[PDB]
Every structure is written in structure tokens, then in C-alpha cells.
Symmetry: D2
Subunit: 444 residues, 4 copies
């Protein structure tokens, strides 16, 4: 039993964008860099439960959660109350100047929540990119080795190094280099497009062989991978792939970094997606869902790695902001109290079965995949695995016109993803999935 | 009657006290040793010119969280704006579903930054991210690879911002290899440069080296702080920056003023670039912008900022709507209270006291800075040999006396003053007197 | 052919013998341990198909000093040209005072390389320097930063050529960090790729990855060996290279054929590119060019080669007049004796013997190559699992029997044949019979 | 000494003449425009102090092919050794089948380089390859990433040696991005540095910057030319190099003396390091080593050179046996004729003439260099403003008079003298007089 602040309804009753959104768009185009861009042409005034309400009073079904961020809802009252309260005491002291309990609380929670029973420590930053940057810093300093491996279909951020680590050039990297050195890309696992029948273990062995031939373990500080590749297309590795990699890394003194920026915090039907794989990452990176929408990120890793860095080596002015920490303590509480991991598993069950039935009735769905509330359909030309990015975009755009916000992704631009807030109601989620299904049938 | 906390220095327990000590045991068990903190006490409230710790001690705050809480660390208008926005939405991702608060901040920054030309803004979370994105814009817009940064510079802790940062320890050491095609040049450091060197000559020396070693046709950008912050509050010789900007303009090189620390009233103007009469092609901002909340900005010529293809400037959290609400409020407070004028008054009163102290002792090599960004460089008597150990000792003794004062510098020997601009005259005077007494004792 | 030395295999002392042993003691006391040598005997003469050591042993030379002494290691016309030029001048620095010998080599190479289009040449000393300068031309001419190299590639031992080289040990390990904006892609390796994979499809896979991860607009050059040499004498599937060159041409990307090892009669044509029907934008050359002397060349489209400002391509020694005289003489010998035809005859006779041998034993996974650049890949029986130890043991046993045969391979399990093309039928037959007997002994 | 060619100037056709003109047409049709040549005439013979062109003109050679043909460009012992080796074998690849000639050169260089400690050598083809391999040894042996090079340095035209080289045009521009973790530092340039700056202080300034910006624990190597060649024949202030080598030793940093240009009799000693009293950990060599043939060498402490795993230093052609035979012969000639002593005599006589000339004109800012590596820096009268255009015009006019003289310099305003050491006194004098007359005419 969840109580909502806003009516959980889809309501589209003006042109899109409406008049007030249009006036805002004119101001936006006059003031904001064209390099930014936005998926939706409407401007938000409220977001609660499973809806976004725009400046003209339209109410959209939110199947994006701000790209997997507002897992607890975009204005959860406990999160809002924690934010307001902390801000009355202090917005900022800089933890590296005058520390505070809120940062310590978050570190404690994350140390306990991440995989493994071993001794761990945490450092907090603002963005997921900063978390990745700092995990790489820890691995390089602790091992004394220079190279880092990242994978095909990877996405890790928009800083120079996280661009280096990211696989796709457009729109993340193109014209923004040259890039941070000693980053090597390897093949990972992509079941749909890899050789038929390839096992996870064999996919891992092929990557290991390439690493040994082309880099050498003695020069490799770290392997970084997303347990489910997010922007690359919600790619779930073949069973056995990740465990095979982690075993090799452990044998070779290489730090294994699981990038759980998108998969972390209930999203995949577990606290962390690494749990489904049985792996215990040496370092985990986190952001998005952590703080109920506020800018917080985290690096949680084996104590001996995290404490290898000299005092002052991990830094930043804002990181572990006390208001964002208060938001995180509250958001993590909500996840526990409402058992949002269980809710994600319920969503996997109901949505995957609907999408699988839809795939049998049309010919444009190449695969239904994902876990928990991180689910996707890959869109292809009938009778092939040829990507159809144009159709993907058209489906997403038609859904928006019908009042349902659905994101896309993928190395080839042809994946419709589903990232609802986990506090969405059954009826509104069903309405959104039905609207999408009708659009897919119409296109097929 | 107006402040929320008592504007008093109150030290009535050992430091750290018992509640801080218990928090510190927790902190050492949970938080990476790579982080570290200046103070051993844990904050529960910060307001006006004070920080109150978990044991009820009250410290005079001459750091502002490293130049961040310019409007105070819990300004009630900032607090109310944060609270209010959070009830509506914490986040939609501006790149997914946009919102007015981001647009408002962009409008405010386009208006506030130097120059009357057409500008656009993009928002991120940290100062390092702002610098990263300024470099991305310059590189894409010019089609050129190289970037120049300077001796004594500091720009952040990401791989590229480490590359752009001069000092290795603790910012860079063991964290490379670093982003390529970054070239370091000499800038202006009047105390330590050749006696009588003009800013124009210092700039011509840098320009000559740039032309010889890089070539304008390969250079996307020159990035410099108008007053170098972590490097030691180094104010360039007059004429230096204008000489550089003129060359950059003539050669199609993007000039980026990194105002992350200097920006927003701090130096007695909205931006420190104003003192120099320069109009930077791009300005980077963070710290003071949002009254303590994590927001950063890149404001630049429209033709540069709009050269980037849609989706090329990105990030999930950037321009967070709660942080934007905070910024709108914080910028309002700066205007309403005329905090630039306040910084100018602080410059006048504090610089004269510090200059008098410098004549009285023999360990102050220079008093420098502008507005409420003021510093003394500590040296061995009769020399300009840095004394970092003494610098550290003075700051630690100040802390034991209830006054939080930060240090910095390429050579670790600069005591800096970064008060919140809402500090009262009497409490600021008390803090400066306590510092002066400690400096006299050490000299 | 008249030979200077008796074309006989003669092993009549311990190996190494006493005089080689005294040289080896001096060598260990004076020469870096980082260098290393395959053979423990010290050369005093090399002619036709033999190497005569300091103790009078005569070895059958199936290596040609790693594909260098194609015209033989002391051809009298090459020696005469070297002697004559040294009497006039050893060096003036072509960039200071030019000379006809450099111009003559440039003219010969412009004529001999693929295509009828306008070309220019620049001369250097080593193959690595040629590759460096081909990359310099491509980067300057295109104004683009990135370069693509491939799995199994080898291009040299300078920092950038190490970057371009795939295998870490012993070429790269501990010698970084490496030159930036080098990206590695899969090429074609028929034995180890998916069974049935066409060259066109292998090329499409590389192209897709290049488009996704780099973007043509950032790509100055693709560099590939037409037959990968140190990587294991890997011949691409038919259609692979043409598919690449077509894409490169369409996208303004400079295509560089690294013919340092394949060049000059070696593969049964002047250039291996001819077998593929491709016309590279730039060709890099060294090894066989100057009958053993240190010369290398970059020959490319005039518009590319002349895009570089005067003084931008340089070096003190490059196009050394004595080495140029050697090259004019060597190229003359290749023409006069029709060494490409001789390479074709060696392919016919040796490939059929080696293929018969492969049916008789169970440790030969593949016989491959073209002309006199031929290889057998050694595997564990009934598998494609590499056997580097056995490969090494075969080569070592051959050396003990007076036959110098080199190895190579990404996995260290390729026995290669690189005879001088002036070897006699009888001595070549003897060498192959000795190798076969050893392989038969090991297959039991 | 007896010569093969007439030791005189002979200018009896237009320059270029008809045969050189025909060759130049062929050259422009066949050779990349990126190469370029100083002289428009084509060589058929070079011997002693002269170069004879395709039309029978004879030039006084004051360049030695850029400091290469120190023993003369066709010394008969060198030519005979070359001929003789080629009849036995041109190449076996030392890494496949080794040979005595490589061992002989390694032994000679181990003995000749500074210090009495245990050393080993590896051979390559070019000076750039020697520098590449010295950096490889230093990085592997120390396990550290960074390399320091200096203002005004030149080390070669490969990607990494371009990175190490200071001047962009024509060595680097548009050829990047460059090998990472190369840091440039100031060295010593007496003419243009602060008046009175000591070498020790110049080194202390570089050391300070290194410690601040890199940290010894990340620094594999410092590489410097004992006299910077292409940068303008810059001789460091006394004490500079020794101060650096002391610091490197104390901090585990490999010090590499790049003697590619200074090496082998050129500066009045076997190696220019001798004049400075330093013992470099690694020396790089090429140019004069093999009497014009393509050989280069890396000679270093045994513990450093042998730290590299077998096969880690390589190349197909390196230590070519014909080039090794040339080197044994050339080094023999240098010993037999005491060419280091000859270089000291040249220094004495030429420096005194050039210094007198500098007193008489107003366009020579400095006379500098050692041995037969001598230079005049050309400036605008009453200033140190470079005059590159005048420098070029002097060299061009000398060529028209039958004297081949090279230029160089960071600012393109240095006339250099690099004669072969077998040039006769009368011909060298004639060359210097022709140059002097031209310089007088210009002043």
C-alpha cells in the first residue's frame, strides 16, 4: 500500500509541447548549449510515483526514471524531508575540511550492502563518471600497474578517461580526444550477436587470451565491466562469463571493478546485479539510484585497496555532499522498507512474459532481455538480426505522443529499454506496457 | 538576533571532544584512508561565520568549505529553495525531461559573466566536470588537439583535470598515465619571478614558448585561473592576462578562465576576470554558485557552445533541479546583500591588518589576493625559502584556538583566508587577531 | 647461378664450436642481455643458401636473416655496388646535399608498387621508421588523429610501432606508456576464426567496429600486413583486404600496406598486395629492398606524400647512398633472375611436400603462405591447441642438424620458411627433408 | 694528410648547374616534397674538406652531413672495411645469427664512454632508434613511467623522439598525438637566461619543477644533449649537468646523455660529457660512429642494460655487419689521427677568429660551442632579438661562394660549424674567411 501525492494517471490534453512548455523551450534554446539536447519537448513541474506532470498539466507515464535514477520515485516524501532537514543545518562543509556523520552513515550502509563479507571502505563523489575515475585511481595506485581493460558495448561516462573507457563514439566521444592512455578494449559477451551456442566461459576465455597476448597481466591494473551493459543495450552476459573473468583477475592480481552505476540499488531484482552472477567485485562503482535523484556517487572496495591511497589522494570539493547523503540514507531506507528488490523481481516476471508473447506475434523483436526492472527489447528487420534504429526511434516517439515516456539505447541504436521507478503501480505500469505493445503491433 | 547560530567562538571540550571522537572511530572503520580531513571535529551546524561541532564547540569559519559557502553554509533562502524543489522533484535528467530551473540558472550565468556578446551555458555537478566540458567544447569547436595549462595551476581530480593540474602530491602521483596533449607553461608569480618582470613580458615569454613548442594551429585552448587558488592565491602581474587573451583571439585559440574558486563575489566582483578587463571565451564555475549544493557550469560564446552536436555534452545528474533552485536563491542573496561590495570591504580591512603584521614579524614574505580571497606566504626570515612546516603549525594552533584557517601553495607555505561573506565584522576581526597572535608567537 | 661457397650442409664440430664459443664469451661480456640470438654459432660468411660459421660448419639458411637476404647474403653485384659507392661517399645527408642514388631508388619503387597513379617516395633506415613516417603522412594529410592496427600485427620496436604491434612479449612489455589514439581491430585468421567465415564478412565486422568505436571522421589510417609475418604467416581469407580498401577509399581513410616482410619477390610477386588485387594508398618497405643493407621506404600517392611541408620528413642517415646503391643492384638481381617466378616454384614444390607431411602426422594444424613465405602451424593432436614448446623443440633440433629455421606466431607455434630465393633446388630439398624427418620423429 | 679529391673551391657553372638541374627535375618527380634539401646541387664525390657536385663544382664542406663524416666522407680505410665485409655477408640479423663485428663495436664503445664501471651496448640504425631504446631500458629497469626532456632539445623524428624534441616546426607539427608521460623542463641557455644565473641554480630550478610536477618516484629518466645541437649549439652554464646527475643518482632516475651529435671527437674529447666531469648512466650515439654508415648505439650501466628480458631490444637491421666494419675502421682513424686533439685545435683557432669578428660587427650576439662544434648566434643590432632571415641569407650567400654552412636554432638564427676533422688548415681558414667577409658585408 503506497500513498501517492499526484494522481497516477496518463493525461494528455494539449498539443505536445503545450503553450507553457513552448515558452520554456524558447528560453532554453536562447540560454542553453545546443550540445546538451533533451529527449522530451515538454518541461517538468512535478514527478511522483509513476508520473511526470508538465508545465501545461499533462501527465506522462514515466518508464525511464530519469535514466534509472528515481527508483524510489522522483519526489519521495521521506527523501524530500531528509533533504530539507539537512539543508537547514548545513548544505556543505567539504568533508575533507570538516567531516560529518552523514558521509560516514552512507559509507557504512554501502560497505554492508555490496557483495562479500570481507573488510571494505567507501569514498564518495558526485557523479558516476567521478566514481569510475576514482575506482581506476585506486586500482592503478594499489597495483602499481598502468593498463585498464574495458569492453565492447561499454559505457562509463563523459569525462576524458570515462570517454576512453566507453565503446561508442557517437555522441559520447567523437571530436573530444585525444583520450587517456593505456585503455584497451576487449570483447565481452553479447549472446544475441555472438556465435550461436557460445558459452560464457568460452567468451571469457577468448577475452582472457587476448588480454594475456596483448597486455600481459603484469601491466594490467584493472578490468572494469557493467554486470548488465546499460547504454550498450541492456546486454546480459552469458552465464559463467563474469565468474570466469573474476577468477582470472584474482589469480593475476588484477583489480576487478563492477560498474553498478545503472544496475545498482534494487534495479535488477537484487541490491546489486553482481549477486545474480555470484561474483564479489574488488571495487563497485555506484551513482544513479543511490540518493533518490540527488548528485551522489560512491566507490566501495576491499579495504586494502581503498586504504592504499595516501591521505588527500582521493578528493573533490563537493563529494559526499551532506544534503545528498541525507537523501541516500532515506532512499536506501525506502528500498528496504518497501522491499523494492522484490518489486523489481515481480516486474521482471509480469513484463518479460508480456514482452515475450508480443515477440511471438510480431516479427520486429529480435530479443527480450534484462533482469528485474532493467528490461529491453532489441528491434530488428523481419527475419534477420539487422538493427532497425529508425523504427526504434519511431516507436519511442509515438509512445511519447501517447503520453508514455520510454527511453532507447544500444550500440546500434535499436533497443527499447524499460526503467520504471519501482514505486510505479501495477495498473499504471500495465497501461504503459499496453500502449507500447499497441504501437509495436501497429509498426509490425 | 538575525543569525541562526550564536556568532561566537566557543571551545569548551578537548579537541576532538567525545562525540566527535566516537564519529571518528566510525569514520576510520568505513571511509577510505585516501580521503582525509583537515579538522578532527564533526560538524552538526554551520551558519554565518561559525561551525558548530558534535560536542557543541563553535569554530570561526575562515574557509567556507574551500570558498563554497560564500552566502553562508545554511542560508535560510537557500535552504527553503532546496526544500521546496525536492517536494516537486529531485531529478528528471535534463537530457530526458527538461525543466525551468536549469534554464533560469543558464540565463543568470549568461548575464553575469564578462562581455555583452551572445553566450550559452551547460551545467554539470563538479568543477572538474565543468573544466572537462570546457576542454571538450574548445577541442570540438577548433578541431585542434592541444591544451595549455600553467605552473601553479589546479583544475581537479579527474584524469584530464589531474593532467591540467601542476602539483603532483597529493593530486596526481601514481594515478596516471594522463590525458594526452596537455602542455605546461610558465605564467606570472610576482614574488618568485624575476624582480621587476612586467605582466606583459611574462605573457610574451609564455606566448613565445607556445609558438615554438606547440604552434597556434595545434592549440585548442589556454586554460588559467585568474587568481591561482590551490597554487597559493597567486595574482598575476598586471597586463599578463590581457596579453594572453589578445594573442589567443588573434590565433583562434579558445581562452578559458577557470573561475571555479574566484567566481561569485569572492574577489570583490562577480568574476575575477573583471579586474583584469578580460572577456574570457569560456568561463568555468562551481563552488560558490549554489550555496553549497553540487552544481557547476560552463558559460561560453554561443558559437563555441553550440558547435557541439546534440548529446555531446552530457551526464545524468548535471544541472540537478534542487541544486538549481539553490543557485537561483544563492545568486539572489549575493545581489541583495551586495556581497561583492562586502568582499571589497573585507579586502580593505584585512589587507591593511595583514600588511601591518608583515612589518612586525619576519616570516611573512607577501600579503596578496583580492576581495575575500586573501593570503600570506610564509618564509624563512630574510629569505623567500618556503616554510611549509611553520605554515602547518600556525594553522593547527589556530584550529586548537577555535579558528578554522586553510593552507595551500605549490610549496605548502601559504595561509589563505576564505571567509563566508556573511561573517560579521566583529567575528572576522576576532579570527584575524587570533591568527596574528599565533604568527607573532611563532616569529 | 654460380655460387661463391659450396652449397652443402656440413656439421663437423660441436655446436657451438670452439671459435663460436670464444666469441659468445666476448658477446656476453659486452652486449646487452636484452638483445638475444636464435643461433649459438657466429657467422663468417653467408652465400646462396648457406651460412658458414666461425668453426667451418655450413648451415642451410631457411631464414634469410628474417626475410632480408632474398637475393642471397653476399650477392657479388650487391657487394660491388656497395664497394663502389663507398669510394665516392658514404653519406652527405640527402636533406643537406642530395644525390642521384636516392632519386634512382625512389623512381624504381614508384614504378614497382601497385597502381598506375602518381606516386612519391621517402627513404629511411628501418622498417619501423618507414611505418612511423607512413603514419605521419596519413595524419598530416587527413588532419585526423586515430590509427587502426589489427590482431596478430607486428610493425616494429619504436614506441609508436610497439603501439601498433599486437603481441606484448617480447615486443612491448614494460616499455610503455604507448603512443595515443591507436585502436586494435580483428582481421582475418582463417584457421582460428569461425569456420566458413568469408573475408568479406571478416572485413564487415572490422568496419562495423571501426564505425562504432572510432568513426571515419577521426580515422587517419588503417595499417595492415598483406600476410601477417611475426603474427604467424597469416594469409587473410579472400576478399578481406579488398573490402577494407573499398571502405577506406569511400571514407577518406589512408590505407597502408605494410610490406616490410612481404615485399620484393618474397610472396611470388613484387608485392603481396598484387595477389589481392589491391592498390594501397601507402606501402612501407624494408628487409629485402637493399640485399641486407639498412634501407627502408615509404611509397605513396603523390597527393598524400606531398601534403607534408618541406623538412617534415627527415632523419640524418635515411636513403644512405651506399644502401641505395645496394638496392639498385638487388632489385636488378630480382628482375634478372625473375625471383618472383622462383618464389612461385618454391611455393608449388614446398607446399605439396608440407601438405603430404601434414596428412602423415597429427601435429600440423595448417600449411599456409605464398611464394617463399611459407609456414606450418603446430598443434596438439586432434585439436587447434597451440604447442609452442614442440615448435621450439623442432626448430632447435633442426639447428643441431645444420638447418636454420625460424619460428613465429601470436601463440609461438608456427614454423616458418623464408629461404633466400637464390637457394638451389637440391639444398632446399635437403633442408625440407631434414625438417620433415624431425617432425615425423616428434609425431610418434 | 693525403686526399683523393682536390682540396679547393671550384665554382665554374651556375648553381645549380645543368647536371644538377636535370637530377633536380627527376627528384621533384619522384621524391616526397616533405623531405627537402639545403643545397640545390647533387653530390658525386665527397672527401677531406670538399663536396664535388654533378657539374664539377667543388664546395668547402663545413657541415659534415650534419656532424656525421667526422673522419671524412670517403675515408679509404672506411671504404675498404665496407667493401670487404660486403663480400662475406651484408646481413644475417644479429638476433638470428650473431657475428664478431657487432661484438667488436660493443667492446669499443663500452671502453670509450665515460666511467670505469661495468657497461653493455646494444646497436640500432638511427640516433632516433638509440634514444627510443635508451628510454625503453630506463622505463623497464626503473619500473617508472615519466621522462623529462628540455627546452631547446632535439632527439629525432619518431613519435616518441618527436615528443622529446622541443621545437614544433618542422619536427612535430601535425604528426601527433605524441607518446605520453613526456615532461619538458627548462635547462641552461646562458645568452637568454637571467644574467649571471649559475649552472647550479639553473639545475636547482629544473629539479624543483621536477619534484613539484612529476615526483622522483614516477620519473624513469632525464635525457639531455651535453651541447644542444639543432636547438642552437647551446652549451650549458658550468655546473648545470653535474647538479642534475647528482640529483638523478640520489633519486634512482636514469640519466641519459644524448651524444648523437656531440659524440666521437667532435667536441675535443671522445664524448662531450667528459668536459662536464659527468658519467651518464646511458649514452646514445649515432652520426660520427660509422664514418657515414647507418649505425647507432646505446651504451649503459650493465645492471640497466641487462635488466631487459631477452628479445626486448631488437630490430632486423641493427648493428649491421657492414656498418660495424665501417665503425671499427672510423674509430680507428679517430684514434690514429688523434681527431679529438684536432678538434681542440680547431676550437682555439676558429673561436678566436669568430670572437674578433663579433667585436667588429654588431649582428653576432654570441660565439659559442666546443671543439669542432661551434656557432654564432645572429641578432638585430644592440639587442638579442633573433634574426633568422639574415642567418638564412648569410648561409645562402656562402653556398654561392662555394662554402656549405648549415644553420640551426630554436629561433632559426644560429650559423653552425661542423667541419670534417680531416679538413686541412688552409681550406678551413678559407671557409671561415669567406663566411667572415659575408658577415661583414651584411653588417
Amino acid at each position: 500500500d503506497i500513498t501517492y501525492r499526484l494522481a497516477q494517471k496518463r493525461t494528455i490534453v494539449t498539443p505536445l509541447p503545450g503553450p507553457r512548455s513552448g515558452a520554456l523551450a524558447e528560453r532554453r534554446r536562447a540560454a542553453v548549449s545546443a550540445g546538451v539536447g533533451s529527449t522530451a519537448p515538454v518541461y517538468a513541474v512535478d514527478a511522483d510515483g509513476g508520473v511526470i506532470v508538465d508545465a501545461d498539466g499533462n501527465s506522462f507515464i514515466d518508464l525511464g526514471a530519469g535514466i534509472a535514477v528515481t527508483t524510489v520515485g522522483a519526489s519521495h516524501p521521506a527523501v524530500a524531508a531528509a533533504i530539507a532537514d539537512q539543508a537547514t543545518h548545513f548544505t556543505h562543509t567539504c568533508f575533507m575540511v570538516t567531516p560529518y556523520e552523514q558521509y560516514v552513515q552512507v559509507a557504512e550502509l554501502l560497505n554492508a550492502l555490496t557483495p562479500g563479507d570481507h573488510d571494505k571502505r567507501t569514498a564518495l563523489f558526485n557523479s558516476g563518471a567521478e566514481a569510475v575515475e576514482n575506482a581506476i585511481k585506486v586500482a592503478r595506485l594499489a597495483t602499481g600497474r598502468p593498463a585498464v581493460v574495458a569492453f565492447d558495448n561499454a559505457y562509463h561516462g563523459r569525462t576524458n578517461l570515462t570517454m576512453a573507457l566507453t565503446a561508442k563514439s557517437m555522441p559520447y566521444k567523437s571530436q573530444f580526444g585525444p583520450f587517456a592512455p593505456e585503455v584497451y578494449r576487449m570483447p565481452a559477451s553479447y549472446p544475441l550477436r555472438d556465435e550461436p551456442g557460445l558459452t560464457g566461459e568460452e567468451a571469457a576465455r577468448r577475452a582472457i587470451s587476448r588480454i594475456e597476448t596483448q597486455i600481459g597481466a603484469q601491466s594490467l591494473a584493472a578490468i572494469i565491466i557493467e554486470p548488465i551493459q546499460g547504454e550498450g543495450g541492456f546486454i546480459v552476459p552469458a552465464p559463467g562469463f563474469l565468474a570466469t573473468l573474476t577468477a582470472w583477475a584474482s589469480e593475476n592480481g588484477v583489480v576487478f571493478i563492477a560498474d553498478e552505476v545503472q544496475t545498482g540499488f534494487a534495479r535488477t531484482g537484487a541490491w546489486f546485479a553482481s549477486e545474480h552472477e555470484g561474483i564479489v567485485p574488488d571495487i563497485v562503482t555506484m551513482a544513479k539510484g543511490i540518493a533518490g535523484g540527488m548528485p551522489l556517487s560512491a566507490v566501495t572496495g576491499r579495504a586494502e585497496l581503498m586504504d592504499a591511497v595516501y591521505a588527500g589522494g582521493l578528493g573533490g570539493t563537493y563529494g559526499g555532499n551532506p544534503v545528498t547523503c541525507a537523501a541516500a540514507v532515506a532512499a536506501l531506507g525506502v528500498m528496504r522498507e518497501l522491499d523494492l528488490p522484490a518489486r523489481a523481481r515481480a516486474i521482471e516476471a509480469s513484463v518479460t512474459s508480456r514482452l515475450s508473447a508480443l515477440a511471438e506475434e510480431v516479427d520486429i523483436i529480435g530479443e527480450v532481455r534484462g533482469r528485474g526492472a532493467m528490461l529491453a527489447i532489441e528491434i530488428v528487420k523481419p527475419g534477420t538480426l539487422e538493427p532497425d534504429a529508425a523504427l526504434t526511434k519511431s516507436i519511442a516517439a509515438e509512445a511519447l505522443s501517447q503520453g508514455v515516456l520510454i527511453l532507447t539505447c544500444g550500440t546500434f541504436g535499436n533497443v527499447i529499454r524499460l526503467l520504471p521507478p519501482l514505486v510505479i503501480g501495477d495498473d499504471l505500469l500495465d497501461e504503459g506496457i499496453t500502449a507500447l505493445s499497441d504501437i509495436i503491433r501497429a509498426k509490425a
